[PDB]
C-alpha cells in the first residue's frame, strides 16, 4: 500500500505525453477531500504490482510530492490494443 508520484509541469504537448507513455510512466490526477486539483505521474509496473493486494477497490498511500494521502481507483482509461493503461484517477478516501 505505497506509491511514489512526481508533480507534472503545466502545459504538456502531445509529443511530451507520447514520450512519457513511451517509457514506464502514465499521467494521473488527484482530487477529493482536503485537497485541490494536482496533476502527477506514476509507474505502470509499480502500480499493477501494488493493485493486486487491495484489488480493484482498496485504500493506497500515494506520495504526492512530499505528502501521503489515502486515495482509491475511481476511473482508468484502458487501451484494448497492446493492453496498456493511459490515465488513472485518484479520489481522496478521507
Amino acid at each position: 500500500a505505497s506509491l511514489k508520484s512526481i508533480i507534472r509541469q503545466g502545459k504538456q504537448t502531445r509529443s511530451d505525453l507520447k514520450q512519457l507513455r513511451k517509457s514506464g510512466k502514465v499521467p494521473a490526477v488527484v482530487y477529493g477531500y482536503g485537497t485541490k486539483n494536482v496533476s502527477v505521474k506514476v509507474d505502470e509496473v509499480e502500480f499493477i504490482k501494488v493493485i493486486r493486494e487491495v484489488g480493484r477497490n482498496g485504500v493506497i498511500e500515494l506520495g504526492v510530492g512530499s505528502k501521503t494521502i489515502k486515495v482509491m481507483v475511481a476511473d482508468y482509461q484502458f487501451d484494448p490494443l497492446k493492453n496498456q493503461i493511459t490515465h488513472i484517477d485518484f479520489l481522496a478516501i478521507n
Binding site: 499493477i48 493493485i51 480493484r56 484502458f78 484494448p80 490494443l81 493492453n83
Partner: protein, 137 residues
C-alpha cells in the same frame, strides 16, 4: 443467413472504413473471444461459415455469442453491362469491423479448447484476429 426483417432504404452509401472501433471492445458474455486488429467488410456468408466450423469442433459443449450483424446491404450489377443505368439489385448484407472490436465469445468449456475453436473460425475470416480473455484490473 443473417439479414434484417425489413429496411427503409434498400440502397445505402457503403460504410466508411477509418478510425478505431466505436464501442464493444470488451468481452461481457463469455470468458474468451476473438478481437480484430484490421479493418474490412464482413459478409453474412462468412459469419455463418465461421460459426458452423466452431460448433462442429465444439460438439455442442458451450455457448457461442455473435457481436456483429449485417445491417448494411450492398448492390452489384450482373453480366458486366455498360456503366450509367442506375443502381443495381441487392446482392447481400455486410458489416464494417474496426480494430479493437470483439467478433465471437465462447463460455462453458476448457480454456485450451476455446483457443483451438477460435483458431479454426479465424481461417474463414478476412481479418487478422487475436485471442483475448476477460480483463479485470
Amino acid at each position: 443467413m443473417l439479414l434484417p426483417k425489413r429496411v427503409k432504404y434498400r440502397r445505402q452509401h457503403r460504410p466508411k472504413t477509418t478510425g478505431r472501433s466505436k464501442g464493444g471492445n470488451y468481452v461481457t458474455f463469455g470468458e474468451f473471444g476473438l478481437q480484430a486488429t484490421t479493418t474490412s467488410w464482413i459478409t453474412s456468408r462468412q459469419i455463418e461459415s465461421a460459426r458452423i466450423a466452431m460448433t462442429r469442433y465444439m460438439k455442442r459443449g458451450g455457448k457461442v455469442w455473435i457481436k456483429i450483424f449485417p445491417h448494411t446491404p450492398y448492390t452489384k450489377k450482373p453480366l458486366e453491362v455498360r456503366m450509367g443505368a442506375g443502381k443495381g439489385a441487392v446482392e447481400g448484407w455486410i458489416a464494417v469491423v474496426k480494430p479493437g472490436r470483439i467478433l465471437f465469445e465462447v463460455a462453458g468449456v476448457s480454456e485450451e479448447v476455446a483457443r483451438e475453436a477460435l483458431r479454426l473460425a479465424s481461417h474463414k475470416l478476412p481479418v487478422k484476429t487475436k485471442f483475448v480473455k476477460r480483463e479485470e484490473l
